[PDB]
């Protein structure tokens, strides 16, 4: 079945958990440092830190005051 | 000295001088001119050129209108006034670009570097790849700087790489700064701080994933 | 030392359309509501400085 | 041939 | 006569269902609102006669 | 500047000016002219046009009657008085429309939305679809606002959706207002108030149907 | 210079200026011209381009009427005044959307909310669906509430749906919060704001994509 | 050619 992303926000002029301008959430970034290594053509590699996104973003209905 | 770049709209009219004694050239970057139309008996000779180009020679002595049609359904008009002198080159350009090509990253990374990355990502997600299976965490896999205390948590191993996660505990009660290079032990391939936090304070409990080499040689 | 930089990872852009009342093929009224889509996706921003 | 035109159709 | 009286038709029954906000494969988030449907078609009726 | 729309009855006669030097055009929206008849040697040339259209050129200098017959058995007459000037376009239209086309709703709704709707309708009717079978009502499926008391009534479940009906009871003895959004519980797909009543008073006992997800993930 | 756009209906007749020595072009933004008819002995030479336009040369001196006809089913008459000068380019904009039975199949084949989303993403990015064609924008197409002014920019139409872009300007000194619903006029079907905006400060420049039923109302 | 118009049908 289709996903249902937002739990009802914290509970002119209608107080609806729905019908609120939706924003998208933030992706999660994780950094891995690679140990210096060598390769078949005998080159020594010092990469640094590689950052990758573990989780894609998801929709969110803002809490309404 | 440099082509006269002219960005006129579709169906646009641009009045430009041409030479009545020497050949002139009109070219569109990224487009190939298909046809050229002018009043009969004005442009004596017209020749296609490598890519999209029209070399035309006009013996006329009167201003005239010339239409150029490219290969992507673009039609531009030009009002040409012949004049004695050098042949003139014109770079015809579109006004507002119709589409935006998203160029994919052509760059590809080294195989070993990818292998380290995928495993780290999978461990973080918690999904464990098919080859990998659970075993015992290594008792001492990392250097402990400044009074840190490490408690084995989890590990999985596979044919060519193995992974261990340890929970760091800080007993220092001081503001410490993390550098993944400190946690190096002869034989480590990579260290990942799950929470990307530069400084740990007292009781800074970041969990770090280290992939060493199973079957180390 | 090589010149260290911090990843940026700019966010996405969202556009929301409001759907005016309509009656469907099987005759069920649909009162006003909305659909949201991502115009331009997120992406890593190349650094301007490496110091 | 007055009022006539001239059009080459490049391949 | 209970019969031979100008017949009227009855009223259809309308029921409203509210759909929970959901997302779809192309990753669009849908906030529909309330959908109204007719559960029962109408039926004939002979008015009561005074 | 704009066609002269003329709605004359069947067999109608409309006197209109035409140009003796330039072509004139008569077209009927939604109809294709099949034939055109005029006194012999009055209209020199007659040509069919994309869709239903007649471009006629008359060199005559005398008023004459011209009959046009369309493809749906419509015949209209026109009295034309040639005059020096611009060609004139005429939009011939029927007087009283013969038939009324009932355009079906072309709009189709999303599959998931239909699935929720059908089930709710079936439960309300009491007919239970083939896949569905009866089971136990869930103990707490909805939020209870303002002192409401819920008693499980009935439920049915199937491969991808499940349904529960609960009877609401109001102990407040106050005038309450219903909003289906109040009865939301993390994991609900839809809420239906069987009686479409906005406000419940004390002992307002509306029964609400909620479809959640069987096999919830 | 830019082509002149005139926007005549299927019944439109426009007095434009035609050239004599050098050729001229009239093209349809969205349709392919298939035939062109003028009084005998008035048009010297005519040619059809690949893009779908028509190149014609008029050597006569008397004012004459020309009919142009397209492939989708359309006919527009223009009155040309032969003047000595350079060639001229005219953009014959439709003004009454054409009938495109092939487009309707794609329009109706898919769902509805999806179709709205698609047509809107396209308007935002600029990748206009293949079947859609540029039509004259509706001068008054949305409700203007309490002090806004509008100007039209672009419009694309298929068979059962339209699409308009309206530049909104806030005359009122005080910033006005705007909700999509304010704009609803009978016959509109979705209102979407490009820059999602809770409020619009005075001197605002906000474009809003509104779509309507083609020919509805 | 009296009353004759130029009607070119393009393919």
UniProtKB/TrEMBL annotation, chains B, F, G:
Keyword Phosphoprotein attributed: no
Domain TraK C-terminal residue range list: 104-212
Keyword field contains Transcription: no
Annotated gene: traK
Protein name from the UniProt record: TraK
Keywords: Plasmid, Signal
Domain TraK N-terminal: 11-95
Domain of life of the organism encoding this protein: Bacteria
InterPro entries in alphabetical order: TraK_C (IPR055397), TraK_Ftype (IPR014126), TraK_N (IPR010563)
UniProtKB/TrEMBL annotation, chain C:
Domain of life: Bacteria
Keywords in alphabetical order: Plasmid, Signal
Keyword Signal included in the entry's annotation: yes
UniProt protein name: TraV
Name of the gene this protein is made from: traV
Full-protein residues shown: 154 to 204 of 204
From TrEMBL, chains D, H:
Source organism, top-level taxon: Bacteria
Protein name in UniProt: TraB
Species of provenance: Salmonella typhi
């Amino acid at each position: 079945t289709v996903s249902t992303t937002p739990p009802v926000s914290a509970g002119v002029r209608c107080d609806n958990p729905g019908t609120v301008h939706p924003q998208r959430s933030r992706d999660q970034i994780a950094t891995v440092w690679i140990a210096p290594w060598v390769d078949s053509d005998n080159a020594f590699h010092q990469p640094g830190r590689v950052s990758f996104v573990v989780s894609p973003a998801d929709w969110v209905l803002p809490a309404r005051v | 000295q440099s082509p006269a770049t002219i960005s006129l709209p579709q169906g646009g009219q641009f009045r430009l001088s041409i030479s009545n004694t020497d050949p002139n050239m009109i070219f569109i970057p990224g487009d190939k001119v298909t046809a050229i139309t002018a009043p009969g008996g004005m442009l004596a000779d017209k020749r296609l050129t490598r890519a999209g180009g029209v070399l035309f020679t006009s013996v006329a002595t009167r201003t005239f209108t010339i239409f150029v049609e490219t290969a992507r359904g673009q039609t531009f008009s030009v009002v040409a006034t012949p004049v004695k002198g050098e042949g003139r080159v014109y770079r015809l350009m579109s006004a507002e670009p119709p589409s935006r090509p998203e160029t994919r990253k052509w760059e590809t990374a080294q195989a070993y570097e990818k292998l380290l990355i995928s495993l780290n990502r999978a461990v973080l997600t918690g999904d464990i790849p098919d080859g990998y299976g659970e075993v015992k965490p290594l008792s001492d896999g990392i250097r402990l700087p400044g009074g840190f205390s490490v408690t084995p948590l989890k590990a999985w191993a596979g044919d060519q790489l193995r992974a261990d996660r340890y929970e760091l505990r800080n007993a220092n009660t001081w503001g410490v700064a993390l550098r993944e290079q400190d946690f190096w032990k002869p034989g480590v391939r990579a260290v990942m701080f799950d929470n990307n936090a530069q400084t740990l304070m007292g009781g800074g409990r970041m969990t770090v994933t280290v992939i060493r080499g199973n079957g180390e040689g | 030392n090589p010149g260290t930089v911090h990843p940026q990872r700019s966010r996405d852009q969202i556009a929301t359309v409001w759907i005016a009342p309509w009656v469907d093929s099987d005759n069920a009224f649909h009162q006003p509501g909305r659909v949201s889509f991502v115009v331009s996706p997120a992406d890593w921003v190349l650094p301007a400085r490496v110091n | 041939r007055p009022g006539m035109m001239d059009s080459q159709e490049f391949s």
